[PDB]
Symmetry: C3
Subunit: 446 residues, 3 copies
């Protein structure tokens, strides 16, 4: 019939979502047959490997993609039009992140997740084990991000970022701390974006002298998009083992719900309202077109983000699916998506704002109005250079709580349920710019 | 006369082999005049340096050669012909390595190197000094190689590979070990081969759009082959100091022979039979042509392998000498030699199989038939990703002995005679693919 | 009037030198209002940051500049003319460094900086804190530099150099030390220069086959020079915070003068005589043209060197200002300046020679004539690969003093006044080759 007509023509849509429900089904099946203790750590890592091979194999594409697509992108058009394009671009992610994070305030205020339950049983959450975090100061973090932009060595910017630590070497008579930088390991995605855009304007500022080299990076981009076409077919195999691997690791019974499940129901709902009902309403108001036609065409990287739980490890999947399944130009789509991959971490900002209210709803705190705007503007500003580190939501939450001087006594309670909720973060994180990609397609016609 | 006619026209053949006998002559001359103690470690490293400068200066060529020649190679012809070419290729190294390693079994079985001699005086071999090796588990090693293929960061794949260690951090109540990866330093040659072939097909899959970039990497390959032409003339100077440097370092008297010299006579003979009598017989059976005409034309990298004692540090020397001194096409020779440099370590597999029989010939062990095929199939499979580390034959021998549960009580006896026998490994290691290069030249005519 | 005519047309000359006097004015103003203790280390690093952002942002340009300009430079002309050009080039920096360092001998001999003052009060200088330096041996340092030329991995040559340390692992019965190399972090500028020149000849040795790739690196150089045009305008903002940052850090009162100020008056005068009176006299003798017309046109990188206090972090500023403000050809100026940035550290050699006389003028030492030529030829030879490390003058002074066996008992006295005098080193260091750039412009006409 015609049911097999839409079956073959939408195979990637069908094969991906049948895999993510297979991972939950396989994951609960192994936990029902004993679990990780039934297998042991010998045969455990062999089970989680063929999914973990995908998350490794996909990250090697973004170094010859991000630094190569921006030069081919941001050299076709005029620099005055680019600053015209960049002004509407950078304004869009800022308004989205403020509106998403303020949604997390009132959703967590008018629900009270600090309920008389096992959530207020947080005496198990302290545990005296990993209390003394590094927890860098709030001035040094925003100082670090500006230093992380414009990297020191350009080859060093491909695998190691810049960070800062603290040394207690002042035993002069006053035991005070001093900062020192050591360049810990993790890919500096933000540092290479700001180079390639600045380098891309310089070819445009040259005349026909740089006509050879703009054709070079245009071609080098194009073969990579052929190479990522083959990666997409392995992605239904990998996500089946990402989800099923993670279920076996953590004890997902008794602590999933019935201990703090009011909080998980709160923060998933914040990801449910924003991006699925809020961002399509913004897209409908500017385009007067059906957003769910546009949203269905990019369903494969959204399920990939729920597999990988990484925002930057779905960027090549998104750049293909927006370009092919929906009508966008090449240069205008292969420009806004890399820069809009590491500046608009609003699903983090939705997560990071609620959890700070969550521990303040308990333990009797009084954030009436002055603390609300400080906890709003700091979360939308800290969520810029939060790309490389895996548990960035836990690490950058301490600098929120220090600047609004709330108790950080049990941050371990937000931890160990963040394999699930931050997995929903990257779904919403890569969803905003993709709608923002098609939003700029509207009035680029005029 | 005409003796000076063949002298000038075969200068590289004459000048190289007169240097390797000069290194043995110079090395025994310094050891006769006291030795390393007569010079002291101050003036010692100045003596070994101008050879060690060659082994450093040569390795910097293989990064813009391996990743550049494969793209220019594996993009001219069809992908269906490539998989046709790769199937005969990958089958050839597997049959060669099995036939070479099984030759080591019967040569070590029907000679009994565990003789009533100073070889069974292994009480000096234990010494209680470096017994507790890391000695990674046999599942984790083949898990590591698949993870070492498809590297994480492509810039990180140029100088640091991936490995795995063990941490004892499980003091939960059961003191068990856990694996963790840390990316130790050493060039990931295997990780870059599998990228450049996959990247090379992607240009072929593009039409005339990638016509610019295939001409780029074709040219970038060509200037490097001009640059390696100048390196070849320094090679008779360097090998004179590699050999003469190594003789002064180790005490080469009394322990060379007359302690375990039956073993060295056994394993050099295995390198003597295979590759000099076995591999020419295979080449004669498929080509009906004189193999020693072909074997004499590549005598300069074979003596370079006996100098450098490194398989991958003779690849640019081999790619020139096969292309010029013998009749092969450029694209078919500059493709099979990089991929056949890090997959066919059969001289290691000849070494690694005999030494496991050697310590089992002594200490009264009973490998009748079941242990023979396990010690055969594991040695031919572990010898794939053994490129970067210098003492790979000693390190990967422990994972052979664990999987066939033989005593590893004196592995230090195989050590400290491995400067000589593994120096004969790289001779046979780079000899197989060069014969395999001309073997594919036969029926590429049809 | 016409005073505003020369104001706008020489804005970079005016705006740069008004900033360096603003940094001394701002720096003494903050130290007068308490100082660093008045601010505290919290708000201290925020004050020194916008200057430190310049020194970071500028270093990322020299990797796609040094390795790219030399190939485009050293491939236009003939290799016989290049060796003709390189012979006059390498002779010029050697004669300059000998003449500059011998000027430091007689200026320090016939002034006696070891005066009966607080300089001979060096009992505060010992302090028993950091006496046990690594202080590598004099043979191993020149062995290290030759090994640092021709790097191991070409990607590894972009951010980590090679060095050597010492391990005490010989507890055989004689407690002696052994060298071992570990590749500490710092950009290998010298290792990439010697590759790109050798690689640049190889394109010239090819005919029209490499005509594509020489046009590639010619274009890739050109867009970088457009990119450094924008960096120059930020440089008056940065140098205002480099100088004012450094004044607040060190206690610049009482120890600046009146403790060892005879020495600082001696070594600044050596930088004052050479390069301002000696090198223009050499330039006048070969060109018969006004050197101060030529010297005024490059005043902006000279003040940048006094800001950054780094020789290699002014190379892109110098390559533009020589090319535009003065009449030189592009290929002959974008070749001699990178190779003449890391071979002619004569301002270091002026510094490093006087300080060794300085501690020998005190403590009653007898360098009559034999020690004078050894302290002269070693300082002009050690000052080759001294690029990457910040405090290279302190570190390489110990290998001078060991080879002329003077007491190293207070090397900390030369330290902590080296923020000022080595800041004058990089002024004279980048001044010699720029005069040498225009010196080769004279008889390139014939
Ligand atoms: C949790 O809180 C309830 C009351 O809300 C209390 O009865 C119970 O003992 C607490 N602890 C646990 C482990 O359930
Ligand atoms: C080595 O073995 C021989 C017997 O073959 C014996 O005579 C000799 O003492 C042994 N040497 C040592 C050091 O044990
Ligand atoms: C420094 O030297 C002067 C001599 O001019 C002497 O008066 C003073 O006591 C010395 N100070 C110290 C701390 O040695």
């Amino acid at each position: 019939d015609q049911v097999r007509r839409c079956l073959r023509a939408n195979l990637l849509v069908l094969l991906t979502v049948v895999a993510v429900v297979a991972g939950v089904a396989l994951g609960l099946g192994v936990s029902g047959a004993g679990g990780a203790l039934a297998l042991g750590p010998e045969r455990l890592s062999a089970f989680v490997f063929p999914g973990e091979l995908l998350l490794r194999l996909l990250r090697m594409i973004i170094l010859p993609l991000v630094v190569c697509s921006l030069i081919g992108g941001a050299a076709s058009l005029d620099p005055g039009a680019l600053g015209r394009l960049g002004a509407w671009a950078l304004l869009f992610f800022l308004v989205t992140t403020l509106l998403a994070s303020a949604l997390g305030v009132g959703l967590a205020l008018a629900l009270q997740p600090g309920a008389a339950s096992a959530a207020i049983n947080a005496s198990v959450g302290a545990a005296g084990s990993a209390e003394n975090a590094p927890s860098k100061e709030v001035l040094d973090s925003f100082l670090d991000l500006a230093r992380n932009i414009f990297p020191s060595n350009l080859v060093s910017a491909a695998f190691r970022s810049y960070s800062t630590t603290y040394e207690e070497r002042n035993i002069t008579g006053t035991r005070v701390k001093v900062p020192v930088g050591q360049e810990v390991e993790g890919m500096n995605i933000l540092g290479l974006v700001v180079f390639a855009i600045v380098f891309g304007v310089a070819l445009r500022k040259l005349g026909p002298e740089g006509e050879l080299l703009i054709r070079f990076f245009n071609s080098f981009n194009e073969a990579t998009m052929v190479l990522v076409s083959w990666i997409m077919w392995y992605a239904p195999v990998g996500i089946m083992f990402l989800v099923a691997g993670k279920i076996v690791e953590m004890e997902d019974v008794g602590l999933l719900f019935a201990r703090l499940g009011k909080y998980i129901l709160c923060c998933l709902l914040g990801h449910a309202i924003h991006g699925l009902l809020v961002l399509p309403l913004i897209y409908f108001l500017f385009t007067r077109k059906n957003p769910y036609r546009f949203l269905w065409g990019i369903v494969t990287p959204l399920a990939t983000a729920f597999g990988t739980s990484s925002s930057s490890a779905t960027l090549p999947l998104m750049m293909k699916c927006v370009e092919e399944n929906n009508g966008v130009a090449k240069h205008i789509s292969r420009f806004i998506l890399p820069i809009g991959a590491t500046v608009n971490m609003d699903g983090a900002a939705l997560f990071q704002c609620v959890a700070a209210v969550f521990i303040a709803q308990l333990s009797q705190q009084s954030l009436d109005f002055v603390k609300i705007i400080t906890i709003l503007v700091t979360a939308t500003a800290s969520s810029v250079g939060a790309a490389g580190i895996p548990a960035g939501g836990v690490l950058t939450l301490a600098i929120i709580l220090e600047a609004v001087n709330l108790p950080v006594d049990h941050i371990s309670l937000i931890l160990a349920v963040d394999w699930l909720v931050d997995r929903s973060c990257t779904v919403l994180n890569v969803e905003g710019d993709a709608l923002g990609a098609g939003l700029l397609q509207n009035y680029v016609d005029r």
